[PDB]
A paper describes a structure:
The PI3K-related kinase (PIKK) SMG1 monitors the progression of metazoan nonsense-mediated mRNA decay (NMD) by phosphorylating the RNA helicase UPF1. Despite the confounding name reflecting a possible evolutionary origin with a lipid kinase, and in retrospect the ability of some PIKK family members to bind inositol-6-phosphate, all active PIKKs are Ser-Thr protein kinases. These large, multidomain enzymes share an overall similar architecture: a C-terminal catalytic module (comprising the so-called FAT, kinase, and FATC domains) and an N-terminal α-solenoid (that typically serves as a protein-protein interaction module). SMG8 and SMG9 form an unusual G-domain heterodimer.
Globally, the α-solenoid of SMG1 rearranges, consistent with the notion of a stepwise compaction of SMG1 upon binding first SMG9 and then SMG8. Locally, the mode of interaction between SMG9 and the SMG1 α-solenoid differs between the two complexes. Hence, the conformation of the SMG9 segment observed in the SMG1-9 complex is incompatible with the binding of SMG8 to this part of SMG1. Importantly, the reconstruction of SMG1-9 showed no ordered density at the active site for the PRD, which is in contrast to the ordered PRD density visualized in the SMG1i-bound SMG1-8-9 complex. The structure of an SMG1i-bound SMG1-9 complex reconstructed from the same data set as SMG1i-bound SMG1-8-9 did not show ordered density for the SMG1 PRD in the SMG1 active site. This suggested that an interaction between the SMG1 insertion and SMG8 was important for stabilizing the autoinhibited state of the complex.
Numbering used by the authors:
A (entry chain C): 170 to 285, 293 to 343, 361 to 435, 455 to 519
B (entry chain A): 615 to 626, 632 to 682, 698 to 877, 881 to 895, 900 to 1060, 1067 to 1099, 1103 to 1151, 1178 to 1259, ...
C (entry chain A): 2139 to 2232, 2245 to 2427, 3607 to 3661
Amino acid sequence: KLLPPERMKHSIKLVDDQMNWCDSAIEYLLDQTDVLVVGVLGLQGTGKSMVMSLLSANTPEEDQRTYVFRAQSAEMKERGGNQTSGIDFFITQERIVFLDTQPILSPSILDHLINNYNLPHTYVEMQSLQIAAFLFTVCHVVIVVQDWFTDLSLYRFLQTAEMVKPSTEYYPHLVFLQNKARREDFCPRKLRQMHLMIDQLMAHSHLRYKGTLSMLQCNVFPGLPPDFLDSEVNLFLVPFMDSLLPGYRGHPSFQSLVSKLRSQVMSMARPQLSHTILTEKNWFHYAARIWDGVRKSSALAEYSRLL
Amino acid sequence: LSALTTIGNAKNWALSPTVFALLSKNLMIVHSDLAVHFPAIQYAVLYTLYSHCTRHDHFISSSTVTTATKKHFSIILNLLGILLKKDNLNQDTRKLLMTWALEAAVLMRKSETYAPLFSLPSFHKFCKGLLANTLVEDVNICLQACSSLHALSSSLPDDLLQRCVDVCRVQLVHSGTRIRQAFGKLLKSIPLDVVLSNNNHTEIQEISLALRSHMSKAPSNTFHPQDFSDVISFILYGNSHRTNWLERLFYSCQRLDKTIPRNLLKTDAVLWQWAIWEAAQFTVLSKLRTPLGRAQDTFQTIEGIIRSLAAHTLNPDQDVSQWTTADNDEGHGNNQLRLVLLLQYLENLEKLMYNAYEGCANALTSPPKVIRTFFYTNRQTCQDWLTRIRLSIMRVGLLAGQPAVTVRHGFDLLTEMKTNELEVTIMMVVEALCELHCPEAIQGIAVWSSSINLLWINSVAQQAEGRFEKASVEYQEHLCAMTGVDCCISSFDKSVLTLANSSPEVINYLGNKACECYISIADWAAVQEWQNSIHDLKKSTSSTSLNLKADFNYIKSLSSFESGKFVECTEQLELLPGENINLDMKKLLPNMLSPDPRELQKSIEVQLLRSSVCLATALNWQSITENVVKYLKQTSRIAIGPLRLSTLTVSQSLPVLSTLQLYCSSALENTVSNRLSTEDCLIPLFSEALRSCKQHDVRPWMQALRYTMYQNQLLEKIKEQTVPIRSHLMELGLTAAKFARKRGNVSLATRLLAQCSETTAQDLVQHFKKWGPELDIEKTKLLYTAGQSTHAMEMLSSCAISFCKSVKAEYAVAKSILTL
Amino acid sequence: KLLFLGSDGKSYPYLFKGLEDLHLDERIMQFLSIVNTMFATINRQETPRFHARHYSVTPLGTRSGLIQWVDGATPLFGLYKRWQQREAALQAQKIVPRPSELYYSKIGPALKTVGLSLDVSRRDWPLHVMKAVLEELMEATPPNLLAKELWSSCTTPDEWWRVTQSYARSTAVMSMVGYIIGLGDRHLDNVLIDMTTGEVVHIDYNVCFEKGKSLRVPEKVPFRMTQNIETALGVTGVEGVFRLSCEQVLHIMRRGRETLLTLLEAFVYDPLVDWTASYAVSVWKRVKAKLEGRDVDPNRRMSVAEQVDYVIKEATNLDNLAQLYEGWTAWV
Ligand SMILES: CCN(CC)S(=O)(=O)c1cc(Nc2nccc(-c3ccnc(-c4ccc(NC(=O)NC)cc4)c3)n2)ccc1Cl
Ligand SMILES: O=P(O)(O)O[C@H]1[C@H](OP(=O)(O)O)[C@H](OP(=O)(O)O)[C@H](OP(=O)(O)O)[C@@H](OP(=O)(O)O)[C@H]1OP(=O)(O)O
Ligand SMILES: Nc1ncnc2c1ncn2[C@@H]1O[C@H](COP(=O)(O)OP(=O)(O)OP(=O)(O)O)[C@@H](O)[C@H]1O
Ligand SMILES: [Mg+2]
């Protein structure tokens, strides 16, 4: 007399490809409070679907075909086209809501929009900005994935997006994840440089990007002292799938790192959104309301008129 | 470093700075602090040294050129120990060191001429490093360490084996599967003389400390109702509705804004305890308003479940659903696991309620004011409910084989009785104490109750100590004196035995206890006589309430098997439940199996007997080996149940019956595929237990002897060369005889003495007047304990005279003279 | 109080004592170690270990000294203090008085009503008044302060049973050792308990060798056997494993009393020991008489069972608990 409602087997489309709300996840929500929301931001081929699938209901021992979130296929990499479009949705058994996101400023979207108000570039930029604001207003934790380092363009985009939010103010947490890492990225000398440049590039970001999710506290570097770094920011690295010196790949096992990241993300804080207690159904309604409100907003139009 | 490999890997240059010393002593600063910022240099140096040493067989033969390399193995071992003992190593470096250690360990056992290498301090440091390498987050490292330890299992001192036992115990319950199997095999390879030791376990103590620290912390109130519902459904009904879910739940229940060790997060015991404690806290903190129903709904549900379980104890034919029927071998074990978790949950709930209505000091944090004010007004209701359910809780606890729960509940019930429900409480408490081998508590309760008709408690107190003969005699005398009819049976002389050491429920208890006591010493004739006496007494008394709760078919089967008559044994075994006799594998245990450990032990014994008779009939190499091996493997897999259950809680010890059954199953499995060709087919019970297992009774040696005689008699049907079992059998018989005599069991001791040598005091005198000296000393000791001091003295003096003109006469003349 | 650090990063706290000779303390600890050594054989075939917790002390001349510090031990007075605070808070809902003030608040009115006054000498006090005051005080403090503390500090029932048995055996051994030596001033602040294992350990080893009988308020109880201590052993009380443990301890001590006697003989002839703080001869004779079984008897020697029974009865009778110092806390 206490059986669960139902178990989700595959992700659903929360936002349509034409920027339209899709109310089809109510049957998978209950009247429970204290829910966790995860958002993801990144480039075209960063690997958001793979990381989200591995962190929600998948393990590296599985195959990309049975993953919760559909990943890129062999025939799609050659054409250089995106795979995930719109916004996805999936809830695990632990009552954890996972939200995916389509690529931002991806050339595939522009190419598909060419053969279809002034220029498509402005429309793509506005769409990315709107999705970023939505992810920054109703998500408890946001993870940023970057295929390569020193992009110098995503930080500015995030700073501009945080200033175009709709509305005792609340700032969601952020996580810097570097996908497809190499041995050169697993050295203390480079780690310090990464931390200093990150701190100097987000001096007045007004966000929570430090004091939580410390890499040094994850036992990755057993002998590295915490005082060696001036300020250990919330950063994490992910290596590839599992030469005068044989062996010595230069980084820990991929499974161990993904497991540690999953545990750290699962044990993250869950602060209140507004000055009222929100439930699963209430959270969904709030998300739909803010989505509709941001669609017909004035900040986006004002910013677009300047371009 | 890479270029130096040309000279390092040379096959024969005598330069001033030796390459070995250069990479082992000159470049020793790279392991101090350079390994933290530049681990590549350390890895390269270690790789070069390993490559240069592996080409010369790690310099083992040496331990001109030979004289120069006379101190290389010690240096290598010392370096390995120092590096492995560290806690700030890299993954690649640790893996390379583990591989090198495994190779060295395997090569160390390649020959028997390297025996002196097991005493150097370098070897001890290496073993310490290997022991410290296991029990880490990495799985491959643990597997490599376990394999290396299992390789050179022998030649290690008791100090290392003691820690290895604790490591295997804590690792027996892991979220993975390979780790459990590896540690299980390693544990099986350890002799029983160390596994049964009463030494303190550091790992169990650490787990207990972590749990205590977690409970002592302030409440978190982060447990969601869905998690509680899932746990309740998995405990009351067995369905969890989840697909390593414990680790995920534990990680999701934590918070980063606001401390259990990570290495202990992979253990199911810690996770289960944490989940139960959190569920109890959520139930108490929610004013008993759990999603299961209203405030009284939870009480009614728990009361009904406990009442049904308690009722099933009286009549095992009830066959309670969701608690007695399983679908495979996993369900049977899961049932017992759920029962244990339920008992723990009830205990935690009681502790929380007590701390919530009054408050503890330096133990648990005080709950909010609302909880205290709500529990203070409804304290009478809670006390009444607990008191009303204590009787059922005691029965449930005894059924699940948890005497501690019933002992605590009985003590609380007796304390609350400050004002015919009194005899039953004492009965249950006495039985529980008897199962824990605590004669002092039994005697104390007997004396305390004497001031309120309860003179039979002394018999149970004496029985708990191991004196089965005296206990049986006292039981028969008490039954005859309280019933009015003669219920005595043939046995040894009462005068000699003493010098060597009314309600229907009470009558039934005494009869059942006497039957179990007689079965313990393996006296089939006595059991038959007892059954006849009970039948006659019942027919001449019309009790209509006395009935022995023991399947006589199993007893008859055991007697036939021990007598060597396999023809009748097969027919008797055919009527036993479960899978048919071997001529499909997962569902070996039958349905409607009670969660009582006694039933599981009986089923395991039946399976072993079936396999033994099957092999005996098949013998008189793949005809009957492809199925027997699988059958024994499944039996051994099911026998790891109690061992894991003991580790689930902080018990600091393991059951002797379960451990012996598992060891016997493993020995049988090895003898089936080896046909008695290796020493691994013998029982690890040696004489070493004389100075380390004096707190156990004679029951454990009975199983070992029973299964050893089978192989001894089976040797007559093998023409190929086999290992000698006469020495092992004689050693086991002598040790068992010594332990039997050390407790007054004159009958069992005499039986063992007669068996090794191949009812009246004069009978022993007329039948008694490498292991020769031990046998003579044992005979003299038995005669002295039998009351014939003169005969024992004469035999000891004659023995001393004979040993004085012997060859060795080292531990015989001295012992004989001292005893005399 | 200071602190030292070792090579293994382990902290070893210590205590600095000045103007107080500690030569006798080292000898007492040596005696405790020697008596503990005799329990090596019995500790091989028994679940509860026969051990007496103790620390090490080293003198730094003639007045200074260092005393080893033990962590993880909680004094028994703490539980009583918390209970008093909880009771006061509960009463105020709908500081705490000191033992001296609380005892006087009850001994004053009784004496005034019986016809006497508080100005009379302490020795000139009726026995019934003291007995009544003690009985009234015992009925106020519940005996579950320590009995339930161990239960609330455990995790599993097996652990609770193990700690209970260990605590009972440790308490019996410690009490017997204190009675043989003659340790006095056993108040709540001089006894510590380890919730991790349940063992009991003493602290102030100053009033020993029957030195408590010469104070302004002589003590007749051999050891501390208050309501809380007796209740913490179980429902049986002092007739279960406590009596058996005491008998075993006495048997072991009497079997090897030669070592203790020789050690004490060497103790007397020590130029660095100052008993004054023929006295040593009297102390040695008293210890020898206690070990030989002729504690209080002209020529009859009491057996182990009789000695244990007499000691237990003399340490639990109400005729001796009432006539004692207020700070000894005879009601808790
Ligand atoms: C709650 C307050 N406390 C209890 C009172 S406590 O002290 O603060 C405390 C004490 C421990 N345990 C501990 N460990 C090591 C040493 C002592 C200790 C303490 C005081 N005095 C002595 C002492 C002094 C003199 C002599 N010698 C003579 O008298 N004549 C020759 C012998 C002994 C020893 N106590 C643990 C925690 C805490 Cl809190
Ligand atoms: O030689 P064992 O047969 O193995 O047993 C003896 C002896 O047993 P008995 O009491 O039956 O003579 C005693 O065992 P416990 O009484 O402690 O259980 C014990 O000491 P005691 O003889 O003083 O009683 C010790 O003998 P001991 O230490 O005196 O030499 C012991 O083993 P060992 O004789 O081999 O040492
Ligand atoms: N750490 C990694 N190492 C190597 N290959 C990776 C790694 N992470 C992802 N990939 C691969 O890169 C591709 C990532 O595409 P995927 O569909 O998983 O997500 P995505 O890059 O977020 O896609 P989208 O274009 O829809 O934004 C896949 O082919 C995946 O196998
Ligand atoms: Mg994608």
